[PDB]
């Protein structure tokens, strides 16, 4: 089992479309009813859903937000009735310090909800977090929740889908501070999926609805095998151990109109495609640390071995000199059309990601020398006296970059 903590407008939407994808996959009706064709289903549902006496299924989700508008719109959707009104929380009434201050203020009810959800699962495995690191809501609230959660639950995993601000595009003027602080908290508490609007929209090209549909696709494909038990990799901890910051790529990212080219898609061509920098959805002979490829559809392990052999000989990849990939196979949901003969998802750890922080650090250093937009931060208690928090966070990020 698992819980999802989605914050800010970004996280709220991310959750909306993630649950849309999930209910589509598992044959869950918008109202929580189960379709007749899926009555005898074999798919495991406990992982993301828990059924109710009324036979309906409820997501293990909690909605958090500093503002009402987004969730109010969500509850006007056809999927509104599905969620649990008890879990959803809205502030009665764009800065990280303010977000963390509110988090300190509203500890009690949030952790009440979290405890209630936790006690309903026998074998909870970890946590899932969806949020954006730039905006005031996501950054600060996620920081506070991560801190108090790692404190509260020292034996549960914490996984996040953190969305990083666009850089080529000059959105949050105060983004460097929030990003740097959120990164501090991620290193200091997060167990383990980086995301950026820049490269994501780049691949989308070459509305937020479609972008986050792709993101939800990534999340669902990541959790597929856990959802669909097989032989190997039957747990999230198995995933994490096989890799341990990450980046992702998915081959069949094709529009509903781009099915006309039914290209004979082997496993070799897919696994190859997952390697190119173009497909890496995120934007010094930098090299890899780990690679995992989850493959959906018919697959012959002989083909997998041949592809691995050929790629190894062709040396299209580079590895650490000081240490000695993985190809897991799953089964598609029996419901969604198998427009793709075989499909592939890749999650990897690669040193080049360091550059991200070097940019943000460069951004942050490009402001701290002139004290820009610190007036609001001084208002909050945390930065009321000084900003030693900022210095510690910057040095922590520098240490991480040095370690990479």
């Amino acid at each position: 089992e698992i819980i999802t903590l989605q914050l800010g407008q970004c996280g709220n939407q991310i959750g909306f479309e993630f649950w849309k994808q999930l209910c589509a996959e598992h044959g869950i009706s918008p109202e929580g009813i189960v379709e007749e064709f899926a009555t005898e289903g074999t798919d495991r549902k406990d992982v993301f859903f828990y059924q109710a006496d009324d036979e309906h299924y409820i997501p293990r989700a909690v909605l958090l937000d500093l503002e009402p508008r987004v969730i109010h719109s969500i509850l006007n959707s056809p999927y509104a009735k599905l969620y649990n009104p008890e879990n959803i929380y809205l502030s009665e009434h764009n800065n990280w310090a303010s977000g963390f201050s509110q988090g300190e203020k509203i500890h009690e009810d949030i952790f009440d909800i979290i405890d209630r959800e936790a006690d309903g699962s026998d074998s909870l495995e970890g946590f899932v977090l969806c949020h954006s690191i730039a905006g005031g809501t996501g950054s600060g609230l996620g920081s506070y929740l991560l801190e108090r959660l790692n404190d509260r639950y020292p034996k549960k995993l914490v996984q996040t889908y953190s969305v990083f601000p666009n850089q080529d595009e000059m959105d949050v003027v105060v983004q460097p501070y929030n990003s740097l602080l959120t990164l501090k908290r991620l290193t200091q508490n997060a167990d383990c999926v980086v995301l950026d609007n820049t490269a994501l929209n780049r691949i989308a090209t070459d509305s937020f609805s479609q972008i986050n549909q792709l993101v939800s696709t990534i999340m669902s494909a990541s959790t597929t095998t856990l959802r669909y038990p097989g032989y190997m990799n039957n747990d999230l901890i198995g995933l994490i151990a096989s890799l341990i910051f990450l980046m992702t790529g998915y081959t069949p990212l094709t529009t509903d109109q781009s099915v006309a080219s039914v290209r004979k898609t082997t496993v070799l061509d897919v696994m190859r495609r997952l390697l190119q920098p173009k497909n890496v959805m995120v934007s010094t002979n930098h090299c890899y640390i780990a690679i995992l490829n989850i493959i959906q559809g018919e697959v012959d392990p002989t083909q997998v071995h041949k592809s691995l052999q050929r790629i190894r000989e062709r040396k299209l990849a580079n590895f650490i000199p000081w240490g000695p990939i993985q190809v897991a196979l799953s089964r598609k949901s029996p419901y969604l059309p198998s427009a793709h003969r075989v499909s592939g998802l890749m999650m990897a750890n690669h040193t080049s990601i360091s550059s991200l922080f070097e940019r943000t650090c460069r951004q942050y250093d490009k402001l701290r020398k002139r004290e820009a937009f610190l007036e609001q931060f001084r208002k909050e208690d945390m930065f009321k006296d000084n900003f030693d928090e900022m210095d510690t966070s910057r040095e922590i990020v520098q240490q991480l970059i040095d370690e990479y």
């Binding site: 995993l157 032989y231 190997m232 901890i237 198995g238 151990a241 096989s242 240490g323």
Partner: protein, 218 residues
């Protein structure tokens, strides 16, 4: 006629599919409880270092197929499989200071690669062929042979019958590194052993009979 009335009506084939399923999901929760003993404690857990003899009940119409000496072989592969799930899960549940992590990936890989070999390349290759064979059963006798030609071959690919103290013990002794390193949570004296036994493993398996090369890459 006999095979026809044996698909249902004392469905011997249906019983056989369940057999290789309740071991080789469900059995994930079962073993995880054993990680954290008593002989009755396990039963309620099941109904929910090398022991745990497992058996089953077979009706007379299928007793002739799944013989008594057939239970032990099915039990043999189950014991060894768990020790792999053990080491794989023991090094997975957790999450010169950081130098230990380099000993993790250098090891969490190796046990993971082996597990990918026994289950997928063997416990699923011959399994996919066996089902395609039994569905064409046309005889009382040959159904025994196609079945007996499934264990005595899966006990050979999975190296457990012979060459144990020559090859199998190497994988067994390095499995003790998965136990020792798991508890501690001397460090330099581990890689001197690890880089030796692992090289001992490849410099011994290098004699490759031919199907061993599917793992010889690492």
């Amino acid at each position: 006629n006999l095979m026809q009335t044996l698909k249902k009506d004392y469905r011997l084939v249906e019983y056989l599919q369940a057999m290789r399923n309740f071991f080789l999901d469900t059995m994930y929760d079962f073993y995880t409880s054993i990680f954290d003993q008593n002989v009755s404690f396990l039963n309620v857990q099941l109904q929910e270092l090398d022991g745990l003899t497992l058996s089953y009940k077979v009706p007379w119409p299928v007793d002739i197929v799944i013989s008594l000496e057939c239970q032990k072989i099915y039990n043999q592969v189950f014991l060894l499989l768990l020790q792999i799930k053990w080491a794989k899960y023991s090094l997975d549940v957790l999450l010169q200071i950081h130098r230990m992590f380099l000993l993790r990936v250098k090891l969490m890989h190796f046990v993971n690669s082996l597990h990918n070999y026994i289950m997928t390349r063997i416990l699923h290759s011959t399994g996919l062929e066996f089902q395609h064979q039994v569905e064409e059963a046309k005889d009382l006798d040959q159904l025994i042979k196609i079945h007996y030609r499934y264990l005595s071959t899966i006990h050979d690919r999975c190296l457990l019958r012979e060459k144990v103290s020559f090859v199998k013990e190497a994988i067994m002794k390095v499995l003790n590194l998965a136990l020792m390193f798991a508890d501690g949570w001397s460090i330099e004296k581990m890689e001197s052993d690890f880089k030796n036994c692992h090289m001992f493993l490849v410099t011994i398996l290098n004699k490759a009979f031919p199907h061993l090369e599917s793992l010889a890459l690492s």
